[PDB]
Amino acid sequence: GHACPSQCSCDQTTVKCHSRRLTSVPAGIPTTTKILRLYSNQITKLEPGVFDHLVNLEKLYISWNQLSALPVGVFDKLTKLTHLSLGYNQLKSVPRGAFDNLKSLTHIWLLNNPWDCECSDILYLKNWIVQHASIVNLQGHGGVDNVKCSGTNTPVRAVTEASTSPSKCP
């Protein structure tokens, strides 16, 4: 069954693509998928729309990669998502409104990214983690104060807008 990507193992609605030295999200993840494990790989980029067919997805683990950014709208179709891990990546910000369609989210992991607290792109993440602090970095991952600024390890929630500039941005 090539409904299952050759690089992953598919246990009904649970797709195991983790710990497989992958450099991109495999194409053809089955639309039945409720749990997608993509953690512990060599992914640096997500293609725009890569998850859009996974309308049933409840858990998305993409921690322990080298993701340098998120495309605009990449989570917008995942309206059933309860769990999202982005920990242990190379993210400097997330696009404005990245989480806004994730109305069912109960758990997010954002620790151990080089969040760029000098750049105004940080402000959506800062406001969002203050608003949704109770779901951030749960299960012994250090909570909302473990979303930390690159270089200083100051909690992102402590960043004042007056500390940021659009001109210190990529």
Ligand X SMILES: O=S(=O)(O)CCCN1CCN(CCO)CC1
Question: Applying CB under 6 A, which residues contact ligand X?
Answer: 39, 61, 63, 85, 87-88, 109, 139, 141
- In the complex, the smallest distance separating the C-beta of residue 162 from ligand X, rounded to whole angstroms, is 31
Minimum CB distance to ligand X smaller for 6 or for 139: 139
Give the start-end residues of each E strand in the chain.
Answer: 9-11, 14-16, 35-37, 59-61, 83-85, 107-109
Task: Tell me how far, at minimum, the Cβ of 61 lies from ligand X, in Å.
Answer: 6
Is residue 128 exposed (0-12), middle (13-18) or buried (19+ Cβ within 10 Å)? buried
Chain position whose Cβ is nearest to ligand X: 87
- Comparing CB distances to ligand X, the nearer of 63 and 93 is 63
Q: What count of residues does the chain have?
A: 170
For 44-154, list the strands marked E by DSSP. 59-61, 83-85, 107-109
Helix (H, G, I), strand (E, B) or coil at 44: coil
Contact by Cβ (8 Å): 126, 157: yes
Report the C-alpha gap between 140 and 128 in whole angstroms.
Answer: 20
Check residue 52 and report its DSSP letter: T
As given in the structure block, the two tokens for residue 33 are 């998928």
Considering the complex, what minimum distance in angstroms separates the CB of residue 35 from ligand X? 10
Q: How far is the CB of 156 from ligand X (least distance, A)?
A: 16
51/61 with CB nearer ligand X: 61
The residue (of 67 and 69) whose beta carbon lies closer to ligand X is: 67
Of 91 and 118, the one with the shorter C-beta distance to ligand X is 91
